[PDB]
Amino acid sequence: SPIQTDLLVAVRDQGYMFITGPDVIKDVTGEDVTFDELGGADEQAKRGNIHKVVNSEAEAYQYVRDYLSFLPSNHFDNPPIVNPGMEPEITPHDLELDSIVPDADNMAYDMHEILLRIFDDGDVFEIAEQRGPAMITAFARVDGHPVGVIANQPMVLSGAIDNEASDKAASF
Amino acid sequence: VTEPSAEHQVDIHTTAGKLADLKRRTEETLHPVGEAAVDKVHAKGKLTARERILALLDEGSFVELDALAKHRSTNFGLEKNRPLGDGVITGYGTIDGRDVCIFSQDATVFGGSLGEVYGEKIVKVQELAIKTG
Amino acid sequence: SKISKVLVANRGEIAVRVIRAAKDAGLASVAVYAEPDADAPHVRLADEAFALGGQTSAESYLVFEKILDAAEKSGANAIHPGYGFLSENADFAQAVIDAGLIWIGPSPQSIRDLGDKVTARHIAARAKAPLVPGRYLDKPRHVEAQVIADQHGNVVVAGTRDCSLQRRFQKLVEEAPAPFLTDAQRKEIHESAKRICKEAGYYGAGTVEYLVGQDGLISFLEVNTRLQVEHPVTEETSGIDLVRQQFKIANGEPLDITEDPTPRGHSFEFRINGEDAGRGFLPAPGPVTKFVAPTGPGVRMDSGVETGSVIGGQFDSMLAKLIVTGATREEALERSRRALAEFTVEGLATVIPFHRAVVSDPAFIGDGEKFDVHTRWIETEWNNTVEPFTGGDPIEEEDTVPRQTVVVEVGGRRLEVSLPGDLAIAPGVVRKKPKPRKRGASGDAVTAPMQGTVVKVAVEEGQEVSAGDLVVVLEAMKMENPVTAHKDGTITGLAVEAGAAITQGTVIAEIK
Amino acid sequence: DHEAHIKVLRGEPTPEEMAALMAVLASAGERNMWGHPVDKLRYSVFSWQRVTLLERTHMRR
């Protein structure tokens, strides 16, 4: 049932996801694994079964509130419009993009330095951060309307689109 | 090796130089058959294809598409004369706050005669207008 | 020989000032500009301008061969070094003379001799300058004596300056003549400056700098051999054109001025640095989206930027100098208060709010016979009321609402009123506190916190480091920004090298 | 309080002038889908707009 759902949040050292317990695996195969290795939330985020790992239930609830804050209730209704019309003009923060790309083509940089500036504000809400980290899948707002942002991340793997970046992008 | 300011260009191997290069090409799109043709058009008291759009649309609402397009015909030496924009200016703009798609043919470029990329640009703006409604 | 065509090599304000002096001389003037300075006023103001290459100062303005190439190409016959780069580079001054160009400045011998701290002390002793006994000074006042000297050894003390409002040993506000000094102190400082200059064999303009102890003990601090950025308050009180005087000296002419001119009135100078005084006086790059100069009676502006300028992180933050003059220090302060009230600079942080503050402070107004300011007063006693710069950034929820500004006349009073775009005096719009444009980590990348240049790389490839260890130093706006390892691990990728220009968010290295 | 207020950027009125200003400014300041055009459009039996226009109109609230 969980794997059907659109968003999976899990709690570190508390949430685990596995189809067969370490003991059953040992008995059938003799392979030896810990719950952290087989089940653990960070391992499942790296494998991409889970979209967010947090440290507490309160953080999980907040992440849900934020996630839903970009989405309509359903396929047919419209998403919330939040802080439309801010900064109608060219700001210093826009002018800073003119020199944000390194001069030497081999230099890596953090794409967040662009994402935090090209959208309405810093509310780039990242989803599946750890899954295929060469790729960023995030919500943002343009003139207060929600948008999904797919960006490459030169800071990781030179931004090459690996298997998990591909599947993350597709599902997003 | 230093140079007079009239000759010097920022190093194209830098972001600043690439941006300057974009500025140069953009400027070059304002007078794609040379300034003399624009002067010859104003001498008759007529707006250019660009000015007609900028007058019709709301101020600053115009977003130009395919500004740097060049024709690719090699017939009868056309490869020697490849003016930027291929003689049509295309984009979208608000009128009275409501969006519209627009194209405007430039008589200075080959008499405004329709060619390959010229047609492709009009086609693109049409498709955009239809999909966006 | 004589100057017939000058080349300058400095950016901003002093380039403009020397171009102006050259035009007053009727001399042709050549600017040189780095790639960032293609838009700067001096490039347009000079009679012609020659491109220098490279982004950094170390590429563009420090390279002797590029300035000498530009002098050759432009046919300039004289060199003016400005403030920053080469004014005390005796090796450059020598290469200039070796070129046969007129060096508008002191002899390379004296530049090197007075630059050598020990040699300068010996010279001071030989001159019988007032030496601080021993002693350390706890609240010293920083005074100075502008000197003019011809190649024939005539020396004139054009006046004193007080430069005690400093941060990081860098001046913000200065005033002339040095106030609240006894005539004995003044005579001492004048004599001392003349002696030190003749004993050093100095010629050209230069400044002798001193500290005054709370007990009035004068001490000679250093000689700065180059029209100091504060020359204007001496020009305005004394009436001298100090740059032309440098021209007259470099022409080998004797001084016109036979005796130390009596100052008229008083003058203040305020350095309009692009630094946020509400933060820790931190320089920041940005656009100059608005710049409107203080204007009118008793106000002079020397400014290196204009509306639409862009200050990149590669050069000193000084945007402008505001100079204000009056018949008395009191009147000069009143006029300064007006001028700073009229000043508006927008798009980047300036120290203008600090200037406005300090010209109102009793510690700097004084009791009429002394004042309390000292060279550490800004860092240790000034109560920094200035709030950080935010520009237009919407920061609270109410800031996100569009606003229409209207002028309303009520009983004739011109009120000016801002009307919110939804005031009940957007069918489903929500307002909430917008998030700052900031990244709120575990990641392996060390990333550059701002644009700059990489003046030092501390690590080597494959080295292991620990959290807090230095990775690089970034020079930004001639300020050091040490960047440090955020976690323990091995340097396993390393892109930077010394002298590289670097953009914000550039991955310096990977710690794994 | 995060409400957006009026703001007198420049000058000060007396209380009587403020009262005049505020009085003047104050004195100056269901679905029925029947025959909606989307019903009037003619669609192909397989036209995707039957989803993305017609339903996305009738169902939308």
mmCIF file of N, CA, C and O in Angstrom, chain B residues 11-89:
data_model
loop_
_atom_site.group_PDB
_atom_site.id
_atom_site.type_symbol
_atom_site.label_atom_id
_atom_site.label_comp_id
_atom_site.label_asym_id
_atom_site.label_seq_id
_atom_site.Cartn_x
_atom_site.Cartn_y
_atom_site.Cartn_z
ATOM 1 N N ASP B 11 37.197 38.954 -23.618
ATOM 2 C CA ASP B 11 37.555 37.580 -23.956
ATOM 3 C C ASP B 11 36.349 36.642 -24.005
ATOM 4 O O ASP B 11 35.733 36.346 -22.976
ATOM 5 N N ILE B 12 36.018 36.169 -25.207
ATOM 6 C CA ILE B 12 34.919 35.237 -25.449
ATOM 7 C C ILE B 12 35.012 33.976 -24.594
ATOM 8 O O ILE B 12 34.001 33.313 -24.341
ATOM 9 N N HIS B 13 36.213 33.630 -24.145
ATOM 10 C CA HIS B 13 36.393 32.503 -23.221
ATOM 11 C C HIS B 13 35.917 32.788 -21.803
ATOM 12 O O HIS B 13 36.243 31.994 -20.913
ATOM 13 N N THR B 14 35.168 33.859 -21.553
ATOM 14 C CA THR B 14 34.657 34.170 -20.228
ATOM 15 C C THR B 14 33.151 34.363 -20.333
ATOM 16 O O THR B 14 32.625 34.699 -21.396
ATOM 17 N N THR B 15 32.458 34.118 -19.217
ATOM 18 C CA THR B 15 31.031 34.415 -19.142
ATOM 19 C C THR B 15 30.721 35.852 -19.540
ATOM 20 O O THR B 15 29.766 36.108 -20.284
ATOM 21 N N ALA B 16 31.505 36.806 -19.037
ATOM 22 C CA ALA B 16 31.312 38.203 -19.412
ATOM 23 C C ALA B 16 31.474 38.421 -20.911
ATOM 24 O O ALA B 16 30.698 39.163 -21.525
ATOM 25 N N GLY B 17 32.460 37.768 -21.527
ATOM 26 C CA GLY B 17 32.621 37.887 -22.968
ATOM 27 C C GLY B 17 31.495 37.267 -23.775
ATOM 28 O O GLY B 17 31.053 37.839 -24.772
ATOM 29 N N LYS B 18 31.027 36.086 -23.372
ATOM 30 C CA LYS B 18 29.846 35.495 -24.002
ATOM 31 C C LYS B 18 28.620 36.402 -23.894
ATOM 32 O O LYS B 18 27.881 36.585 -24.869
ATOM 33 N N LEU B 19 28.360 36.936 -22.703
ATOM 34 C CA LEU B 19 27.260 37.884 -22.524
ATOM 35 C C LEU B 19 27.408 39.119 -23.420
ATOM 36 O O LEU B 19 26.443 39.553 -24.065
ATOM 37 N N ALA B 20 28.601 39.715 -23.453
ATOM 38 C CA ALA B 20 28.868 40.802 -24.395
ATOM 39 C C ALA B 20 28.597 40.392 -25.840
ATOM 40 O O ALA B 20 28.077 41.187 -26.631
ATOM 41 N N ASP B 21 28.990 39.178 -26.216
ATOM 42 C CA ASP B 21 28.714 38.669 -27.559
ATOM 43 C C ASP B 21 27.220 38.606 -27.848
ATOM 44 O O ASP B 21 26.771 38.969 -28.944
ATOM 45 N N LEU B 22 26.439 38.116 -26.886
ATOM 46 C CA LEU B 22 24.983 38.170 -27.003
ATOM 47 C C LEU B 22 24.482 39.595 -27.209
ATOM 48 O O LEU B 22 23.610 39.836 -28.050
ATOM 49 N N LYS B 23 24.997 40.550 -26.434
ATOM 50 C CA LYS B 23 24.639 41.953 -26.658
ATOM 51 C C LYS B 23 24.950 42.414 -28.080
ATOM 52 O O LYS B 23 24.112 43.051 -28.731
ATOM 53 N N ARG B 24 26.161 42.144 -28.565
ATOM 54 C CA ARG B 24 26.503 42.474 -29.947
ATOM 55 C C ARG B 24 25.506 41.892 -30.947
ATOM 56 O O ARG B 24 24.975 42.615 -31.797
ATOM 57 N N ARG B 25 25.271 40.580 -30.896
ATOM 58 C CA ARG B 25 24.325 39.972 -31.834
ATOM 59 C C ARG B 25 22.927 40.576 -31.719
ATOM 60 O O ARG B 25 22.272 40.844 -32.735
ATOM 61 N N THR B 26 22.453 40.808 -30.495
ATOM 62 C CA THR B 26 21.148 41.438 -30.312
ATOM 63 C C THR B 26 21.092 42.799 -30.994
ATOM 64 O O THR B 26 20.181 43.074 -31.783
ATOM 65 N N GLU B 27 22.055 43.668 -30.692
ATOM 66 C CA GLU B 27 22.166 44.947 -31.392
ATOM 67 C C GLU B 27 22.121 44.768 -32.907
ATOM 68 O O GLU B 27 21.360 45.446 -33.606
ATOM 69 N N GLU B 28 22.933 43.851 -33.430
ATOM 70 C CA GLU B 28 22.946 43.556 -34.860
ATOM 71 C C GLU B 28 21.590 43.121 -35.404
ATOM 72 O O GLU B 28 21.343 43.275 -36.605
ATOM 73 N N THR B 29 20.709 42.582 -34.562
ATOM 74 C CA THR B 29 19.358 42.260 -35.032
ATOM 75 C C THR B 29 18.474 43.487 -35.237
ATOM 76 O O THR B 29 17.491 43.403 -35.979
ATOM 77 N N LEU B 30 18.791 44.618 -34.608
ATOM 78 C CA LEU B 30 17.964 45.813 -34.768
ATOM 79 C C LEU B 30 18.050 46.402 -36.173
ATOM 80 O O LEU B 30 17.121 47.091 -36.607
ATOM 81 N N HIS B 31 19.141 46.152 -36.896
ATOM 82 C CA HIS B 31 19.358 46.741 -38.220
ATOM 83 C C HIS B 31 19.968 45.693 -39.144
ATOM 84 O O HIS B 31 21.105 45.824 -39.606
ATOM 85 N N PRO B 32 19.217 44.625 -39.432
ATOM 86 C CA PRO B 32 19.810 43.430 -40.048
ATOM 87 C C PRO B 32 20.203 43.619 -41.503
ATOM 88 O O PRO B 32 20.911 42.762 -42.046
ATOM 89 N N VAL B 33 19.767 44.700 -42.145
ATOM 90 C CA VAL B 33 20.176 45.031 -43.503
ATOM 91 C C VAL B 33 20.973 46.336 -43.510
ATOM 92 O O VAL B 33 21.138 46.974 -44.542
ATOM 93 N N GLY B 34 21.485 46.717 -42.343
ATOM 94 C CA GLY B 34 22.152 47.984 -42.123
ATOM 95 C C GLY B 34 21.257 49.179 -41.868
ATOM 96 O O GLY B 34 20.110 49.242 -42.318
ATOM 97 N N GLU B 35 21.811 50.142 -41.130
ATOM 98 C CA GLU B 35 21.053 51.302 -40.673
ATOM 99 C C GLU B 35 20.498 52.110 -41.838
ATOM 100 O O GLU B 35 19.485 52.804 -41.689
ATOM 101 N N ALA B 36 21.190 52.087 -42.978
ATOM 102 C CA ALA B 36 20.741 52.832 -44.147
ATOM 103 C C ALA B 36 19.337 52.429 -44.581
ATOM 104 O O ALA B 36 18.543 53.283 -44.981
ATOM 105 N N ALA B 37 19.016 51.135 -44.538
ATOM 106 C CA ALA B 37 17.671 50.696 -44.908
ATOM 107 C C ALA B 37 16.605 51.210 -43.943
ATOM 108 O O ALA B 37 15.510 51.599 -44.366
ATOM 109 N N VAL B 38 16.921 51.275 -42.651
ATOM 110 C CA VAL B 38 15.990 51.855 -41.686
ATOM 111 C C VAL B 38 15.808 53.348 -41.927
ATOM 112 O O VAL B 38 14.691 53.875 -41.836
ATOM 113 N N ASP B 39 16.901 54.060 -42.190
ATOM 114 C CA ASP B 39 16.803 55.471 -42.557
ATOM 115 C C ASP B 39 15.963 55.678 -43.815
ATOM 116 O O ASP B 39 15.124 56.580 -43.870
ATOM 117 N N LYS B 40 16.201 54.868 -44.848
ATOM 118 C CA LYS B 40 15.374 54.876 -46.055
ATOM 119 C C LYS B 40 13.905 54.574 -45.785
ATOM 120 O O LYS B 40 13.033 55.070 -46.507
ATOM 121 N N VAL B 41 13.601 53.778 -44.761
ATOM 122 C CA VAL B 41 12.196 53.522 -44.447
ATOM 123 C C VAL B 41 11.569 54.694 -43.699
ATOM 124 O O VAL B 41 10.441 55.099 -44.001
ATOM 125 N N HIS B 42 12.272 55.253 -42.716
ATOM 126 C CA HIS B 42 11.754 56.423 -42.007
ATOM 127 C C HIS B 42 11.619 57.636 -42.924
ATOM 128 O O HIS B 42 10.683 58.429 -42.776
ATOM 129 N N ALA B 43 12.542 57.799 -43.876
ATOM 130 C CA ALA B 43 12.431 58.876 -44.857
ATOM 131 C C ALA B 43 11.091 58.867 -45.578
ATOM 132 O O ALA B 43 10.604 59.924 -45.995
ATOM 133 N N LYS B 44 10.480 57.701 -45.740
ATOM 134 C CA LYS B 44 9.139 57.604 -46.303
ATOM 135 C C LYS B 44 8.062 57.747 -45.239
ATOM 136 O O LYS B 44 6.874 57.649 -45.560
ATOM 137 N N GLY B 45 8.451 57.972 -43.987
ATOM 138 C CA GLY B 45 7.496 58.073 -42.902
ATOM 139 C C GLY B 45 6.788 56.795 -42.520
ATOM 140 O O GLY B 45 5.608 56.835 -42.160
ATOM 141 N N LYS B 46 7.473 55.657 -42.597
ATOM 142 C CA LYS B 46 6.883 54.372 -42.262
ATOM 143 C C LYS B 46 7.692 53.765 -41.123
ATOM 144 O O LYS B 46 8.919 53.897 -41.083
ATOM 145 N N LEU B 47 6.996 53.110 -40.202
ATOM 146 C CA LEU B 47 7.635 52.302 -39.172
ATOM 147 C C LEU B 47 8.258 51.034 -39.745
ATOM 148 O O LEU B 47 7.811 50.494 -40.759
ATOM 149 N N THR B 48 9.309 50.564 -39.079
ATOM 150 C CA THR B 48 9.879 49.265 -39.387
ATOM 151 C C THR B 48 9.026 48.163 -38.760
ATOM 152 O O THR B 48 8.163 48.412 -37.916
ATOM 153 N N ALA B 49 9.256 46.928 -39.210
ATOM 154 C CA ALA B 49 8.539 45.786 -38.653
ATOM 155 C C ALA B 49 8.679 45.675 -37.138
ATOM 156 O O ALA B 49 7.743 45.233 -36.462
ATOM 157 N N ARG B 50 9.826 46.069 -36.586
ATOM 158 C CA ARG B 50 10.005 46.038 -35.136
ATOM 159 C C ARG B 50 9.192 47.130 -34.452
ATOM 160 O O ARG B 50 8.505 46.882 -33.450
ATOM 161 N N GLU B 51 9.282 48.353 -34.971
ATOM 162 C CA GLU B 51 8.560 49.480 -34.394
ATOM 163 C C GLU B 51 7.051 49.304 -34.478
ATOM 164 O O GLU B 51 6.331 49.750 -33.585
ATOM 165 N N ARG B 52 6.551 48.670 -35.538
ATOM 166 C CA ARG B 52 5.119 48.401 -35.625
ATOM 167 C C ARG B 52 4.642 47.494 -34.496
ATOM 168 O O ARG B 52 3.612 47.766 -33.868
ATOM 169 N N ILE B 53 5.412 46.453 -34.175
ATOM 170 C CA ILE B 53 5.077 45.610 -33.029
ATOM 171 C C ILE B 53 5.160 46.409 -31.734
ATOM 172 O O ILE B 53 4.235 46.402 -30.917
ATOM 173 N N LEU B 54 6.287 47.084 -31.511
ATOM 174 C CA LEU B 54 6.469 47.821 -30.261
ATOM 175 C C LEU B 54 5.426 48.922 -30.069
ATOM 176 O O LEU B 54 5.076 49.250 -28.929
ATOM 177 N N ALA B 55 4.918 49.497 -31.158
ATOM 178 C CA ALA B 55 3.811 50.447 -31.080
ATOM 179 C C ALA B 55 2.478 49.764 -30.802
ATOM 180 O O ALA B 55 1.682 50.267 -30.003
ATOM 181 N N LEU B 56 2.209 48.626 -31.440
ATOM 182 C CA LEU B 56 0.906 47.991 -31.278
ATOM 183 C C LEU B 56 0.768 47.366 -29.895
ATOM 184 O O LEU B 56 -0.237 47.572 -29.206
ATOM 185 N N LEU B 57 1.767 46.598 -29.472
ATOM 186 C CA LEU B 57 1.733 45.956 -28.168
ATOM 187 C C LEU B 57 1.796 46.990 -27.045
ATOM 188 O O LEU B 57 2.074 48.174 -27.253
ATOM 189 N N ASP B 58 1.520 46.511 -25.834
ATOM 190 C CA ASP B 58 1.859 47.235 -24.615
ATOM 191 C C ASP B 58 3.367 47.351 -24.424
ATOM 192 O O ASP B 58 4.131 46.445 -24.768
ATOM 193 N N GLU B 59 3.784 48.487 -23.869
ATOM 194 C CA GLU B 59 5.196 48.787 -23.659
ATOM 195 C C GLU B 59 5.904 47.707 -22.848
ATOM 196 O O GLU B 59 5.433 47.295 -21.784
ATOM 197 N N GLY B 60 7.046 47.252 -23.362
ATOM 198 C CA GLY B 60 7.851 46.213 -22.751
ATOM 199 C C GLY B 60 7.245 44.830 -22.675
ATOM 200 O O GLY B 60 7.886 43.929 -22.126
ATOM 201 N N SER B 61 6.040 44.618 -23.201
ATOM 202 C CA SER B 61 5.408 43.311 -23.087
ATOM 203 C C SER B 61 5.950 42.322 -24.113
ATOM 204 O O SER B 61 5.761 41.112 -23.954
ATOM 205 N N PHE B 62 6.617 42.819 -25.151
ATOM 206 C CA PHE B 62 7.068 41.999 -26.270
ATOM 207 C C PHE B 62 8.203 41.071 -25.849
ATOM 208 O O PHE B 62 9.230 41.526 -25.337
ATOM 209 N N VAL B 63 8.013 39.770 -26.063
ATOM 210 C CA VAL B 63 9.080 38.776 -25.978
ATOM 211 C C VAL B 63 9.302 38.220 -27.379
ATOM 212 O O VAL B 63 8.443 37.514 -27.922
ATOM 213 N N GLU B 64 10.456 38.532 -27.967
ATOM 214 C CA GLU B 64 10.764 38.116 -29.330
ATOM 215 C C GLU B 64 11.208 36.660 -29.379
ATOM 216 O O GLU B 64 11.889 36.172 -28.473
ATOM 217 N N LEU B 65 10.815 35.967 -30.446
ATOM 218 C CA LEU B 65 11.204 34.584 -30.686
ATOM 219 C C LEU B 65 11.962 34.467 -32.004
ATOM 220 O O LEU B 65 11.616 35.121 -32.993
ATOM 221 N N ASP B 66 12.997 33.627 -32.007
ATOM 222 C CA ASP B 66 13.801 33.366 -33.202
ATOM 223 C C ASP B 66 14.427 34.644 -33.758
ATOM 224 O O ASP B 66 14.457 34.868 -34.968
ATOM 225 N N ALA B 67 14.927 35.491 -32.859
ATOM 226 C CA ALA B 67 15.533 36.752 -33.275
ATOM 227 C C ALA B 67 16.742 36.533 -34.179
ATOM 228 O O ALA B 67 16.911 37.235 -35.183
ATOM 229 N N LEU B 68 17.592 35.567 -33.839
ATOM 230 C CA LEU B 68 18.854 35.320 -34.532
ATOM 231 C C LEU B 68 18.740 34.350 -35.706
ATOM 232 O O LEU B 68 19.767 33.977 -36.281
ATOM 233 N N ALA B 69 17.534 33.922 -36.065
ATOM 234 C CA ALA B 69 17.375 32.994 -37.176
ATOM 235 C C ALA B 69 17.950 33.563 -38.470
ATOM 236 O O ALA B 69 17.803 34.751 -38.772
ATOM 237 N N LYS B 70 18.603 32.691 -39.240
ATOM 238 C CA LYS B 70 19.161 32.994 -40.553
ATOM 239 C C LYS B 70 18.668 31.954 -41.546
ATOM 240 O O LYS B 70 18.510 30.780 -41.198
ATOM 241 N N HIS B 71 18.428 32.384 -42.782
ATOM 242 C CA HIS B 71 18.088 31.434 -43.827
ATOM 243 C C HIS B 71 19.276 30.527 -44.141
ATOM 244 O O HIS B 71 20.433 30.836 -43.847
ATOM 245 N N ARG B 72 18.957 29.385 -44.750
ATOM 246 C CA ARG B 72 19.930 28.359 -45.109
ATOM 247 C C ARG B 72 19.976 28.034 -46.600
ATOM 248 O O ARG B 72 20.660 27.081 -46.992
ATOM 249 N N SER B 73 19.272 28.788 -47.438
ATOM 250 C CA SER B 73 19.298 28.545 -48.875
ATOM 251 C C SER B 73 20.687 28.814 -49.446
ATOM 252 O O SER B 73 21.334 29.810 -49.110
ATOM 253 N N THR B 74 21.141 27.911 -50.315
ATOM 254 C CA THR B 74 22.372 28.076 -51.079
ATOM 255 C C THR B 74 22.130 28.319 -52.563
ATOM 256 O O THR B 74 23.093 28.381 -53.331
ATOM 257 N N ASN B 75 20.879 28.459 -52.982
ATOM 258 C CA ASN B 75 20.575 28.717 -54.382
ATOM 259 C C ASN B 75 21.012 30.120 -54.789
ATOM 260 O O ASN B 75 20.858 31.085 -54.036
ATOM 261 N N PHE B 76 21.563 30.216 -56.000
ATOM 262 C CA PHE B 76 21.816 31.497 -56.663
ATOM 263 C C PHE B 76 22.593 32.468 -55.775
ATOM 264 O O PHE B 76 22.365 33.679 -55.788
ATOM 265 N N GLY B 77 23.520 31.923 -54.989
ATOM 266 C CA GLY B 77 24.346 32.707 -54.091
ATOM 267 C C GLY B 77 23.704 33.267 -52.843
ATOM 268 O O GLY B 77 24.335 34.086 -52.170
ATOM 269 N N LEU B 78 22.479 32.868 -52.499
ATOM 270 C CA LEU B 78 21.858 33.424 -51.302
ATOM 271 C C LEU B 78 22.706 33.216 -50.050
ATOM 272 O O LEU B 78 22.562 33.975 -49.088
ATOM 273 N N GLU B 79 23.586 32.210 -50.040
ATOM 274 C CA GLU B 79 24.451 31.976 -48.885
ATOM 275 C C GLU B 79 25.349 33.164 -48.560
ATOM 276 O O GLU B 79 25.817 33.279 -47.423
ATOM 277 N N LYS B 80 25.606 34.045 -49.526
ATOM 278 C CA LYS B 80 26.399 35.247 -49.282
ATOM 279 C C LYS B 80 25.652 36.327 -48.508
ATOM 280 O O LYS B 80 26.300 37.219 -47.951
ATOM 281 N N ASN B 81 24.321 36.283 -48.454
ATOM 282 C CA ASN B 81 23.539 37.351 -47.829
ATOM 283 C C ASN B 81 22.458 36.716 -46.959
ATOM 284 O O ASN B 81 21.395 36.328 -47.452
ATOM 285 N N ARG B 82 22.750 36.616 -45.660
ATOM 286 C CA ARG B 82 21.945 35.876 -44.690
ATOM 287 C C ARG B 82 21.543 36.798 -43.540
ATOM 288 O O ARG B 82 22.063 36.676 -42.423
ATOM 289 N N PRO B 83 20.625 37.733 -43.780
ATOM 290 C CA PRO B 83 20.284 38.710 -42.739
ATOM 291 C C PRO B 83 19.599 38.054 -41.548
ATOM 292 O O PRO B 83 18.775 37.149 -41.699
ATOM 293 N N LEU B 84 19.955 38.525 -40.354
ATOM 294 C CA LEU B 84 19.362 38.012 -39.125
ATOM 295 C C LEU B 84 17.851 38.226 -39.099
ATOM 296 O O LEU B 84 17.346 39.284 -39.483
ATOM 297 N N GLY B 85 17.136 37.200 -38.637
ATOM 298 C CA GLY B 85 15.689 37.194 -38.576
ATOM 299 C C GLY B 85 14.991 36.707 -39.827
ATOM 300 O O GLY B 85 13.778 36.472 -39.788
ATOM 301 N N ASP B 86 15.716 36.542 -40.931
ATOM 302 C CA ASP B 86 15.148 36.143 -42.219
ATOM 303 C C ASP B 86 13.994 37.041 -42.666
ATOM 304 O O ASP B 86 13.197 36.651 -43.524
ATOM 305 N N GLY B 87 13.876 38.244 -42.108
ATOM 306 C CA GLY B 87 12.879 39.187 -42.578
ATOM 307 C C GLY B 87 11.484 39.046 -42.012
ATOM 308 O O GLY B 87 10.541 39.586 -42.596
ATOM 309 N N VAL B 88 11.309 38.366 -40.884
ATOM 310 C CA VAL B 88 10.078 38.472 -40.109
ATOM 311 C C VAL B 88 10.443 38.555 -38.635
ATOM 312 O O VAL B 88 11.335 37.840 -38.167
ATOM 313 N N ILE B 89 9.752 39.425 -37.901
ATOM 314 C CA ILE B 89 9.913 39.561 -36.459
ATOM 315 C C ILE B 89 8.711 38.919 -35.783
ATOM 316 O O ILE B 89 7.565 39.205 -36.144
#
